Amino acid sequence: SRIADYLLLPLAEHVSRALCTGRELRCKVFPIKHYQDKIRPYIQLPSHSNITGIVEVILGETKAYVFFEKDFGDMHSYVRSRKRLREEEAARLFKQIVSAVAHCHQSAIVLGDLKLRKFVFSTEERTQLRLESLEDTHIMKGEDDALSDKHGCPAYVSPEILNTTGTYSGKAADVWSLGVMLYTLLVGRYPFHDSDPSALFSKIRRGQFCIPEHISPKARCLIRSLLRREPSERLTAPEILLHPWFESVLICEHETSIDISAYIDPAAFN
Amino acid sequence: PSRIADYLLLPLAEREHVSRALCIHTGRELRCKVFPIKHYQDKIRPYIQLPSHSNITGIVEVILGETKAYVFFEKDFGDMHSYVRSRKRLREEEAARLFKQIVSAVAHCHQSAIVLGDLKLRKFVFSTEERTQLRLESLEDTHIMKGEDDALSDKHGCPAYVSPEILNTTGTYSGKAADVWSLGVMLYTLLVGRYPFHDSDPSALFSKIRRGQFCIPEHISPKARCLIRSLLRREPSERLTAPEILLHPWFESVEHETSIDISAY
């Protein structure tokens, strides 16, 4: 069926493939009355190589048609296909994932529902990721990030969502999800796993998880920086982006001096 | 207990080749570093090059034996790092009195082309039980420069005190500017009671120094607040020199990844 220089072709929910030129887009179809709130996040957020933009919206009598570039698979199927990722690749990909999240947080968009499925390859190259969708993120006002809508995939849920009543820091929660991602890319399993969701929540509450020996020292203590029990102890998405691991693979009680060179590859950092 | 020359040497478990020395004549208690004679001279070079100063610890004397040199030092009555842990934070009056001595030490070194390299609260020690007067504990591993030059590439120090440029640049960096950043970390920490950037993991701590986000709490005075921000500048050349810190107003002023409703649990 025609829209406006586009053929719509099925995909079975309300996404269909659109085709120009010979260009192949994806196309989400909403009823006009509710299209505008759906696309609000895209408006608030500046464009970014790792966030999926709106290409075009076209209006019909009953429906809005919102046009999206197409993906070539998601990071969750990627990890199943590839049992675990080699740090070089993990770092290459996880950095893009974090830049996406950081860029959102800088523009006061809290993601809320981070998971490997939400990041998709942008070409058949399958070297470049993008946040698939903003459809259900949370548009914040300035520096605020407190939220109480507790919705998401169980393996990625932070302890504070499970043991706090009321609000929680949505950015800190997002960072925990990034920790779950990083673990799961390098290891090949979730840090906390069970078939039953309530059983899985009881092991997140407990917080016991083991990083196997094959993981590098710098990647190990990046993971433990993100999967901290206390949310305020976790790193910010901006500061994850500057953590030694990436360049390496391309008051206290003691004031002990050490060889800083060992933690640092300014060469690779730029 | 063993003799040197009118001195008893007595152990100090925590301290590697330092032992306490005691005069048999007076009742006087010194500290004593032992080196092998062959390498003693380079160790003490900085003390020679530096003019004496009330806030830098001098050599009392060196005694030479066959195999070892014995270098004698006045005793300290605690260091500024334990001081700040003991005392949660310092009141500006005290912070200023003490931090000024700390800066006079550093300034005096920089005037004599000694770059410190490894500044931290632990390196400053009280000189009497009064515990009103500080001195730079040791020059053992500072850097003797030639005239006005100060570029160095070592990169060794305690993580909380490391400047961004050490983490972000390759090659050399201005060692005086780096020393001044360390002084900023010190001033913050004396007044606040926490480091401006802190974490248990060092690589996590470096990622926050790189970011440079730090907050000066509301209880800090206006003049102390901008002194801090004058020293913790990101670009090294913007930071104050140790000479000009000494003249800053503050001091005089005081399968399936399916999403669900988790609420349902």
Swiss-Prot record, chain A:
Lineage: Eukaryota, Metazoa, Chordata, Craniata, Vertebrata
Range covered out of full length: 90 to 342 of 372
Similarity comment: Belongs to the protein kinase superfamily. CAMK Ser/Thr protein kinase family. Tribbles subfamily.
Name under which the protein is recorded: Tribbles homolog 1
Transmembrane regions listed in the UniProt entry: none
Gene source species: Homo sapiens
Disulfide bonds: none
GO biological process: negative regulation of JNK cascade; negative regulation of lipopolysaccharide-mediated signaling pathway; negative regulation of MAPK cascade; negative regulation of neutrophil differentiation; negative regulation of smooth muscle cell migration; negative regulation of smooth muscle cell proliferation; negative regulation of transcription by RNA polymerase II; positive regulation of eosinophil differentiation
UniProt KW keywords: Protein kinase inhibitor
Subunit structure of this chain's protein: Monomer. Interacts (via protein kinase domain) with CEBPA. Interacts with COP1.
GO cellular component terms listed in the entry, alphabetical order: cytoplasm; cytosol; nucleus
Tissues with expression: Expressed in most human tissues with the highest levels in skeletal muscle, thyroid gland, pancreas, peripheral blood leukocytes, and bone marrow.
Domains: entry comment: The protein kinase active site is incompatible with ATP binding and is inactive. The C-terminus (351-372) is required for interaction with COP1.
MF terms in GO: mitogen-activated protein kinase kinase binding; protein kinase binding; protein kinase inhibitor activity; RNA polymerase II-specific DNA-binding transcription factor binding; transcription regulator inhibitor activity; ubiquitin protein ligase binding; ubiquitin-protein transferase regulator activity
Described function: Adapter protein involved in protein degradation by interacting with COP1 ubiquitin ligase. The COP1-binding motif is masked by autoinhibitory interactions with the protein kinase domain. Serves to alter COP1 substrate specificity by directing the activity of COP1 toward CEBPA. Binds selectively the recognition sequence of CEBPA. Regulates myeloid cell differentiation by altering the expression of CEBPA in a COP1-dependent manner. Controls macrophage, eosinophil and neutrophil differentiation via the COP1-binding domain.
Domain of life: Eukaryota
Protein kinase domain sequence ranges: 3-246
Curated annotation (Swiss-Prot), chain B:
Identification of the protein by name: Tribbles homolog 1
Record remark on domains: The protein kinase active site is incompatible with ATP binding and is inactive.
Domain called Protein kinase: residue spans: 4-251
UniProt keywords, alphabetically: Protein kinase inhibitor
Record function comment: Adapter protein involved in protein degradation by interacting with COP1 ubiquitin ligase. The COP1-binding motif is masked by autoinhibitory interactions with the protein kinase domain. Serves to alter COP1 substrate specificity by directing the activity of COP1 toward CEBPA. Binds selectively the recognition sequence of CEBPA. Regulates myeloid cell differentiation by altering the expression of CEBPA in a COP1-dependent manner. Controls macrophage, eosinophil and neutrophil differentiation via the COP1-binding domain.
Subunit structure: Monomer. Interacts (via protein kinase domain) with CEBPA. Interacts with COP1.
GO molecular function, one term: mitogen-activated protein kinase kinase binding
Organism annotation: Homo sapiens (Human)
Family indicated by similarity: Belongs to the protein kinase superfamily. CAMK Ser/Thr protein kinase family. Tribbles subfamily.
Organs and tissues of expression: Expressed in most human tissues with the highest levels in skeletal muscle, thyroid gland, pancreas, peripheral blood leukocytes, and bone marrow.
GO BP, one annotated term: negative regulation of smooth muscle cell proliferation
Superkingdom, taxonomy of origin: Eukaryota
Keyword Ribonucleoprotein attributed: no
This protein's GO CC annotations: cytoplasm; cytosol; nucleus
